[PDB]
Amino acid sequence: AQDDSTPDSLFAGLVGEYYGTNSQLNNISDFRALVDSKEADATFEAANISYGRGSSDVAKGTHLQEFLGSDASTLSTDPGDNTDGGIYLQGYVYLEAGTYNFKVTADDGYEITINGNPVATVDNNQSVYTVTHASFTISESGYQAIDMIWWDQGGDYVFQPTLSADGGSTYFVLDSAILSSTGETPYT
């Protein structure tokens, strides 16, 4: 819902913020502290949340643009170089009541929360790895609150958090089919 005096862009995606740093990101706490510490280095619309893979540091050169791919055209600016960096995504996802689980491929770590509760967590650095996470329930059909953080401490980078509604038999990428920046229905 609206919570201030600023109209918010309605689009079929999550609100994305990118933050870079020249300090080391070791874990979720480090990245959240970076987000806390300053304004985003860039904003974007996260409409197709399947990013990377690439090499030679996400925070260098045009690597962020390459990583974000189809979403990069919504960047507010081209950040300068940093050694480390990551993204913070927030908004809504349409889910019917039922049981779900994430399966996430990433380098480095990440955390996804739904309706305030963590549902997929890797609290450390790692080369590319895919985790099938534990199932969670959605009690009421509709737009659920969702946020994500992901970061790269350096080197390679990838982030693809897929979701299953059928007990792990099939998984889908979160994209414009079901994402909403504000919780209103997007017609874009």
Ligand SMILES: OC[C@H]1O[C@H](O)[C@H](O)[C@@H](O)[C@@H]1O
């Ligand atoms: O230790 C974690 C690191 O392992 C390797 O260096 C990977 O290339 C790098 O992307 C990852 O961040």
Ligand SMILES: [Ca+2]
């Ligand atoms: Ca607002």
Ligand SMILES: [Ca+2]
């Ligand atoms: Ca901030």
Ligand SMILES: [Ca+2]
């Ligand atoms: Ca750049």
Ligand SMILES: [Ca+2]
């Ligand atoms: Ca891509």
Ligand SMILES: [Ca+2]
């Ligand atoms: Ca685009």
Ligand SMILES: [Ca+2]
């Ligand atoms: Ca680093």
Ligand SMILES: [Ca+2]
């Ligand atoms: Ca990395």
Ligand SMILES: [Ca+2]
């Ligand atoms: Ca399958």
